[PDB]
Design a binder for this molecule. Structure first.
Ligand code: Z47
Ligand code: NI
Length: 158
């Protein structure tokens, strides 16, 4: 089991870390959502689908910088929604193919009332998403750690 990003980088068999940049709407008001859909960026696959089933969870989701201070959020993982930052590990998604499949994670961030001005700085760390992978074969239990960086400024109009 391993993962990669679109025109980007890879995390190999056995886990590791990688940095991911995301495009963000440049202006968002109180009451509107920034949607950060990572499923167009992170893709994972099973390396032996004929004898092994891989199980993949969102173990944890954490907010940093401008998101942590100026936004409340939810996360959607494979059709279900959770608070963001997260309060527990999700149910699992099955990886049963050698073909790249998206990692179905999306952040929904809404500015808090105290947000105004540049609420997220370009190039700043906004979130960490941990992918935890296990299987039905052995005791492999691996973390794939995705550091999410803002590509651009996000302004909350006053
Ligand atoms: O995605 C399927 C699996 O692929 C890798 C390792 C499988 C390699 C392997 C090791 C020892 C005995 C094997 C016997 C048959 C097939 C693979 C074997 C690891 O990423 C596992 O965590 C993962 O569950
Ligand atoms: Ni592979």
């Amino acid at each position: 089991f391993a993962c990669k990003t679109a025109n980007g980088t890879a995390i190999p068999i056995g886990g590791g870390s990688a940095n991911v940049y995301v495009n963000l709407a440049p202006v968002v008001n109180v009451g509107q959502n920034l949607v950060v859909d990572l499923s167009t960026q992170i893709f994972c696959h099973n390396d032996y689908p004929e004898t092994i089933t891989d199980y993949v969870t969102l173990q944890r989701g954490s907010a940093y910088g401008g998101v942590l201070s100026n936004f409340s959020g939810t996360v959607k993982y494979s059709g279900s929604s959770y608070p963001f930052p997260t309060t527990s590990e999700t149910p699992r998604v099955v990886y049963n193919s050698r073909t790249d499949k998206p990692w179905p994670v999306a952040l929904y961030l809404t500015p808090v009332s105290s947000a105004g001005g540049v609420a997220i700085k370009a190039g700043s760390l906004i979130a960490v998403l941990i992918l935890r992978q296990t299987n039905n074969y052995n005791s492999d239990d691996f973390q794939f750690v995705w550091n999410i960086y803002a590509n651009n400024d996000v302004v909350v109009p006053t």
